[PDB]
Amino acid sequence: ADVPAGVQLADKQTLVRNNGSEVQSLDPHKIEGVPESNVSRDLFEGLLISDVEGHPSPGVAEKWENKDFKVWTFHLRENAKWSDGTPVTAHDFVYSWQRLADPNTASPYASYLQYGHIANIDDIIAGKKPATDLGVKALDDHTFEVTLSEPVPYFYKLLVHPSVSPVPKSAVEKFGDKWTQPANIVTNGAYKLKNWVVNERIVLERNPQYWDNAKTVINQVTYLPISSEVTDVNRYRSGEIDMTYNNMPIELFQKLKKEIPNEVRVDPYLCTYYYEINNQKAPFNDVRVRTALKLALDRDIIVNKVKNQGDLPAYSYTPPYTDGAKLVEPEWFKWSQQKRNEEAKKLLAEAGFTADKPLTFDLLYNTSDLHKKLAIAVASIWKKNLGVNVNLENQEWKTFLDTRHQGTFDVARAGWCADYNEPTSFLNTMLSDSSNNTAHYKSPAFDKLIADTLKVADDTQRSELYAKAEQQLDKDSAIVPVYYYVNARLVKPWVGGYTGKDPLDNIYVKNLYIIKH
Numbered sequence: 001a002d003v004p005a006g007v008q009l010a011d012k013q014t015l016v017r018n019n020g021s022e023v024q025s026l027d028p029h030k031i032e033g034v035p036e037s038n039v040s041r042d043l044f045e046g047l048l049i050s051d052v053e054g055h056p057s058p059g060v061a062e063k064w065e066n067k068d069f070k071v072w073t074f075h076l077r078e079n080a081k082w083s084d085g086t087p088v089t090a091h092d093f094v095y096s097w098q099r100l101a102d103p104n105t106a107s108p109y110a111s112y113l114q115y116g117h118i119a120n121i122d123d124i125i126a127g128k129k130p131a132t133d134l135g136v137k138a139l140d141d142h143t144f145e146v147t148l149s150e151p152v153p154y155f156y157k158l159l160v161h162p163s164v165s166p167v168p169k170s171a172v173e174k175f176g177d178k179w180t181q182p183a184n185i186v187t188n189g190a191y192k193l194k195n196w197v198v199n200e201r202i203v204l205e206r207n208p209q210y211w212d213n214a215k216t217v218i219n220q221v222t223y224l225p226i227s228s229e230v231t232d233v234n235r236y237r238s239g240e241i242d243m244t245y246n247n248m249p250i251e252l253f254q255k256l257k258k259e260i261p262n263e264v265r266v267d268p269y270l271c272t273y274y275y276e277i278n279n280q281k282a283p284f285n286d287v288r289v290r291t292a293l294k295l296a297l298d299r300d301i302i303v304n305k306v307k308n309q310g311d312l313p314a315y316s317y318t319p320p321y322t323d324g325a326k327l328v329e330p331e332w333f334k335w336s337q338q339k340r341n342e343e344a345k346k347l348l349a350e351a352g353f354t355a356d357k358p359l360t361f362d363l364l365y366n367t368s369d370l371h372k373k374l375a376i377a378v379a380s381i382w383k384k385n386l387g388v389n390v391n392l393e394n395q396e397w398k399t400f401l402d403t404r405h406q407g408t409f410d411v412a413r414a415g416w417c418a419d420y421n422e423p424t425s426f427l428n429t430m431l432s433d434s435s436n437n438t439a440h441y442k443s444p445a446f447d448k449l450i451a452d453t454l455k456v457a458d459d460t461q462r463s464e465l466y467a468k469a470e471q472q473l474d475k476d477s478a479i480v481p482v483y484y485y486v487n488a489r490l491v492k493p494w495v496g497g498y499t500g501k502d503p504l505d506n507i508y509v510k511n512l513y514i515i516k517h
Contacts, residue, residue: 054502090138
């Protein structure tokens, strides 16, 4: 943290943040969500980290070089240490990236190494080559060298993500799945784990061994698992919570900008809200059924009347304001809703659905005030505009993600936030073999367009290919885009250091501070 001259610091430097749900895990190789990553950034630090405005900056690596964007060499600071006092070395990173790549670890982010094109990753994922064949090596204790199979100019931007953070081999090997328990865990970020009560709280305390410990101000941070946005706001207003989670309650939100205008933060966010269709399951494997659902949803009602929290109606997967995005807005989005409805009805009738045999399916969502109210509204809009019947089903976060990976669903509420600011952070998740592909979409044409983006050596050709890739996705109606999120949350007047300038919202509690109040 960089406390501004003049600021009066509170005597007690503790913070309480809501985290939206109970985490899937605390192991960097077993997580995939925002809640999980919020806690991970405080405990595990990778090669690079984001600064307070979101720029890729020095983490464990203090400096790095690249040769033709294919061989990246990272010089690790010599005072980097784990919470047990032992050094963080290049060997830790070799072990860790090998564990991520290993099929036996079954990470949901195994494909992150394919996104960066580390040499030999495809063969390791497939079981053809051993994980020790991965294109990473320790040149010495403080030098980590990564070899890619082709030039990736934006490679370093990927390195702030939890999947590529280091994990402690000795603890993993001795305790197995219980290595993350408070008594066994070892961490290298600004904090360490003090307590973990499932469905109650996660308490972190300052890590004295952290290399930048002298700049850390907050001594303890608590992360809560409240999935009800209304309850999160209530506990914030009662005084218990200092920072809410960033998913807002339909019931209370508008009241808040009038009631407490200086505490309501609203900033740009590179995330897209959508309804995910299981593409491999009949009758959702029929493009007409998918297109009907896409067109019959009325974005103006939902975005402006139902939710009404600052969002923009979406027509794509990658947010149009992503660095490098130059998207073509489709003609259906410019039409009137009545024209969209007509076309949807015609396509469904062509699909084989009558009124004696209507289309009936499930709509899965994760427990939440926001998602429930929106799902009830969408169910009503689809019934009215298209004559379809939907059965709502709620599941807790960890169960919900599992269901989507397994393919045991019809349609599901979904949302993806960028991991790095570049269109492939979104587009790579729709590749046929991606570990992050929960739409179960497989398109050879789509895959080819993305493969060609690193075959060109200029950004104009690259951006045109990304635009074409979005058109392919839209053509196939892989998903039902709803709106582009905004990062809206409540932050007490006394919480300093939160700028809201980072469109990826990669917050580090080591950068915050409590002002005397």
